[PDB]
Design a protein around this nucleic acid. Structure first.
Lengths: 345, 53
DNA sequence: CTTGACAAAAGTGTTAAATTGTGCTATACT
DNA sequence: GCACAATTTAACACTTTTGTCAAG
């Protein structure tokens, strides 16, 4: 069971005394500034040396061998940097170890307040992310609260962290949740509307009306807008929903197929494609061609008068008249044979 | 070194510093090898008998 | 079968409106 | 939950193509 698992794994480490906390932030920021001072030495990027620290701390070749099939060359752009920063005087050297231990402490801080994050995401159940999945997205919202923290502000890390936990959690629930995808602001605005609904339904005691609920919402809100977004609110329906009073029935199979031709439709389109061919044969040789060039019966694409005229050598005016006399000429044969009088839907 | 520059302890003349009343002590089975000028090793990697620290 | 003249339709270019994607706040809360 | 950069869309001024008519 993964559930008790995570809880016990975080329950394997003590939290932090106020001392440990302040000290944590201290050494962490000393390492973060140490790297910044290293950038001014060998002349490298702020994040370059930074990550390369994890390349010797967070692990061996396991950190750069799987951040996707591409992250940044391990033997090339890193190994050269692992030796480029290696030849420096005692003045610059210490600022490296301060980066290793400094960045190290960060992890300790996260692990420490992890027993907080898990207890935060605990009141958020029902989003559609079961605990661990919900908690996890929150844990990353701790990693943001950490690197951006300031001990100097004399504030307990709890206050700063919690807000970044709720941020991440409320961000995942609007970015996952429902089967379909919903842009963030709109996801929120839904929540705002329902939030109002269950409120004035509580005060007035009777459920509201699309007009009054929108009234209590603000300006621009009307009886239609609420129902409008309300349509988009509701999610899809499980195709596995059993229909009827039996256990052998489903809801999926009850859905037909329009994305594929029916045998009667194939035979239909065949009869049209045939009867039209023989009905085409009875026309002037030039107009029989020009006709299927203007309906896209040849290459599947339609050719404008300008093209047809360039095909035969006539003008764009002649072809035009050619069509007029063409269709109207088949008119006479069709008003008789009545073979193609069908297909009128 | 402290939060504000005020609480920072500044040596009054010359002498010897001593740490007392720890919050706790943690013992680790290990072998201590003090140095003087810099270091050729790095935190966390592996060492062996004879290896130059 | 042919011109010239035109209006409607289909282009082509630059904008205003809207819609959507993001980082973030600090009493404390583990 | 909000200020806002990011990107999409509908907005629209206007140019060019294409269907079309009276007359050769």
């Amino acid at each position: 069971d993964p559930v008790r698992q995570y809880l016990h794994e975080i329950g394997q480490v003590p939290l932090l005394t106020l001392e440990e906390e302040i000290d944590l932030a201290r050494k962490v920021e000393e390492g973060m500034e140490a790297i910044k001072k290293l950038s001014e030495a060998t002349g490298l990027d702020q994040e370059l040396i930074r990550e390369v620290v994890r390349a010797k701390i967070l692990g061996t070749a396991r950190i750069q061998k799987i951040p996707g099939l591409k992250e940044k060359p391990d033997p090339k752009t890193v190994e050269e940097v692992d030796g480029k920063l290696k030849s420096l005087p005692k003045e610059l050297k210490r600022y490296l170890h301060i980066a290793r231990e400094g960045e190290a402490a960060r992890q300790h801080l996260i692990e420490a307040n992890l027993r907080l994050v898990v207890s935060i995401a605990k009141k958020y159940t029902g989003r559609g992310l079961s605990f661990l999945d919900l908690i996890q997205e929150g844990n990353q919202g701790l990693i943001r609260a950490v690197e951006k923290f300031e001990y100097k502000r004399r504030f307990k890390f709890s206050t700063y962290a919690t807000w970044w936990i709720r941020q991440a959690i409320n961000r995942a629930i609007a970015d996952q949740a429902r089967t379909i995808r919903i842009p963030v602001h709109m996801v929120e605005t839904i929540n705002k509307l329902s939030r109002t609904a269950r409120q004035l339904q509580q005060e007035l005691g009777r459920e509201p009306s699309y007009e009054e609920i929108a009234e209590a919402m603000g300006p621009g809100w009307d009886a239609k807008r609420v129902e409008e977004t309300l349509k988009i609110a509701q999610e899809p329906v499980s195709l596995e929903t059993p229909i009827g009073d039996e256990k052998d029935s489903f809801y999926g199979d009850f859905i037909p197929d329009e994305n594929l031709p029916s045998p009667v439709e194939a035979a239909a389109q065949s009869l049209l494609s045939e009867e039209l061919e023989k009905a085409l044969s009875k026309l002037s040789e030039r107009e029989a061609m020009v006709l299927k060039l203007r309906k896209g019966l040849i290459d599947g694409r339609e050719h404008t008068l300008e093209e047809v005229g360039a095909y035969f050598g006539v003008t764009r005016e002649r072809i035009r008249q050619i069509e007029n006399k063409a269709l109207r000429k088949l008119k006479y044969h069709e008003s008789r044979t009545r073979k193609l009088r069908d297909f009128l839907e | 070194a402290a939060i504000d520059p005020e609480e920072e302890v500044i040596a009054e003349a010359e002498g010897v510093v001593h740490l007392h009343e720890p919050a706790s002590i943690l013992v680790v089975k290990a072998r201590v090898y003090p140095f003087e000028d810099d270091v050729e090793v790095t935190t966390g990697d592996r060492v062996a008998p004879g290896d130059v620290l």
